[PDB]
């Protein structure tokens with residue numbers, strides 16, 4: 001369980 | 011060429027140290043325009059807010075000051091960092107315009123609230139938001155205005171709290187100016203003039219996390235008073251223990267409303283709206299829903315606190331002592347909760363602040 005690094009703010 | 015300059019910012023004019031280029035607006039609000047800029051000297055982009063009528067009322071003063079102060083005295087990786095603060099005027103006589111500069115992320119939480127995330131993202135985002143607040147609370151500071159407009163995310167999936175112009179401590183009053191926080195997120199103790207604790211923020215936190223799942227404002231409200239009716243219709247009329255705490259005037263009205271039992275959180279929030287449950291326990295709809303039902307609670311004295319939010323099975327699988335229980339910030343002692351001054355007197359402190367803060 002590791003922290004996300006991406007976030008498609010589109 | 012006096013080492014500043016102005017730019018025709020949409021409706022009004024701006025004035026910044028040349029270093030800031032290509033000033034395009036992004037923030038139009040109740041505290042003034044806030045446009046993005048590319049700080050040359052920095053080699054990174056930034057955001058600049060220009061305080062709208064900082065001395066208009068003895069209150070704006072009290073807020074502009076706290077704004078500054080608090081922007082300065084408090085730091086965390088989940089709180090927009092204060093890059094700078096400057097003024098173009100030369101002396102206190104001239105002085106009346108203040109521009110604050112701070113780091114800038116990629117978007118608004120309203121941007122997230124319009125896309126479907128997954129337990130990984132949603133839980134992490136809430137975690138960060140929760141750590142940011144814990145920092146403020148650790149210093150007896152309350153934000154009083156957490157909402158999407160005041161929360162920013164960046165492409166690397168990290169978020170940071172915003173604005174402090176309404177941030178303060180204490181809770182003596184019942185909020186002589188409760189009209190200021192944004193309706194759809196006002197917490198019961200605010201709506202019903204009551205005197206708030208630190209946990210008055212976890213309400214807004216629920217209203218938001220609920221917004222990210224539902225995708226629509228949790229408790230609408232066509233007006234300051236209708237707000238309340240939207241809260242009870244959802245969560246049901248509060249119990250008599252609670253009522254007994256309202257001012258005599260409020261208690262009566264609050265008791266003459268129709269009685270609603272409300273609906274179960276499984277109903278308010280069916281599974282299907284939450285991300286896809288995997289097979290793992292900690293990150294399940296059950297948990298996310300459970301945390302919600304502990305934030306969206308009328309009786310503050312029965313409503314969760316950050317301490318526990320950060321410890322909850324849904325947000326807790328990211329827990330890290332540093333971020334979680336960082337060092338409580340420390341304001342000098344200027345910041346308080348009442349201290350009133352003149353329009354000038356206030357202006358005085360602001361300058362001698364904008365100064366050693368330039």
Ligand SMILES: CCOc1nc(C(=O)NCc2cc(OC)ccc2OC)ccc1C#N
Nearest residue numbers: 036037044046057059114115116117118162
């Ligand atoms: C809400 C605007 O105010 C502020 N916003 C930010 C911020 O990072 N906003 C994210 C953001 C970035 C954009 O790309 C250029 C465009 C629109 C945005 O959403 C508005 C940071 C500080 C303040 C302040 N003060």
